[PDB]
Amino acid sequence: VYQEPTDPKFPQQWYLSGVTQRDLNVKAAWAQGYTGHGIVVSILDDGIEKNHPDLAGNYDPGASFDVNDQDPDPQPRYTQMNDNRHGTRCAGEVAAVANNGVCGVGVAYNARIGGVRMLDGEVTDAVEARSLGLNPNHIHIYSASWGPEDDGKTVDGPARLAEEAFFRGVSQGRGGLGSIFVWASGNGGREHDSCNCDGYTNSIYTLSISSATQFGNVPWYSEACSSTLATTYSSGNQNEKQIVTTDLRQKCTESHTGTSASAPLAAGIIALTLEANKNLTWRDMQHLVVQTSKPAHLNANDWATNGVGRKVSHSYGYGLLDAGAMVALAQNWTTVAPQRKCIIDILTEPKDIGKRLEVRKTVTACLGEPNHITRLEHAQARLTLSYNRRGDLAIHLVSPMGTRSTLLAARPHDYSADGFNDWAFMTTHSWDEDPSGEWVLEIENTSEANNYGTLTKFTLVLYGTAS
């Protein structure tokens, strides 16, 4: 019979297990025999305390580098305010050592863990590319709890070198099966930020992860958008418990918070899943998340049922990760067919937006051709438009099966007159639907002001298979 860990703070790790069912069902994976042995995870952040008493036994120098100072040692820089504690807190969530009388345990407490020191300095395109592309035939899973500013007025994503690093990773990384990139969806809730305005979370090559509070609510910092895939627990109000992990200066903390704590927990659960089937591709892993995640008892006002009967929300994606279900379904999973891509240029002429614009188009989804798609994965609406105040726009897209995705909600702080320049808004909400038929795009002015602009390009890009 499985014996659960004896670490002193393990009883406070409410999100791992318990009899209440408000947990990620991690103990059920442990009891099936999966604890992370043989899997390598790298934390891309401000450094990792490699000599920490709850990390030293799992530390892997092959998964580590210091891009800020150009050396192999990722030790954080010590300061009076402990500014560089962030990466060490994230690492302990994944792979803190078990049964050693220190702090708590990681989700994958027998995995190997490294860190890339890259946030303690100016974060250029080259700095990002060198970190995402580190040792891609040794590191299996990359975790990133950082991104563009969450001020509610920024539109930004990976530049050329960083985008090239994503494509190289999913194509040639992990022996051709593809690197796994896990991303925190953002902390911009108080600013009414949208995570579709962040190109890292909006990318098809990352698994974007949101947060839920202990009592099952949408936290104050949460950002809603259609590109989010799933959810893990994190912090909420001061009556709700928080995350337990390793802290700087060889300490233990019980107050790790925010979107930053959600992505590491997802990375650990994905590490358990890879141990259960090391042949899973980067796309296999997203299929498993979609099928096994759990909406039950997460509170939101926008839960909707999509074309294949699955519940989906802009705050939570397909719901909470379920580690026991992930490892069980992985063991006999059949690899998906190669990915197809069908490009449909919608507009014949530019269209004035005015107060409201609706664009309807019936598509065949490349019928008769080698890239015919009957089983959708991701879909993008790539839009070029001008407008006088960007944050007054709201944008929706409806699939032929009737699923309505919010591509952009109103952003009160976004005063920009710069519009969108071929920006690829992405939705996960129509996964496994047939994309043949009528699609509808809606753009509307949500304010009483007399705003003006023009839509000049709309490309619908479909990804998926025909089996």
Partner: peptide, 6 residues
């Protein structure tokens, strides 16, 4: 105003 934030 950093390009990227924790």
């Amino acid at each position: 105003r950093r390009r990227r934030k924790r």
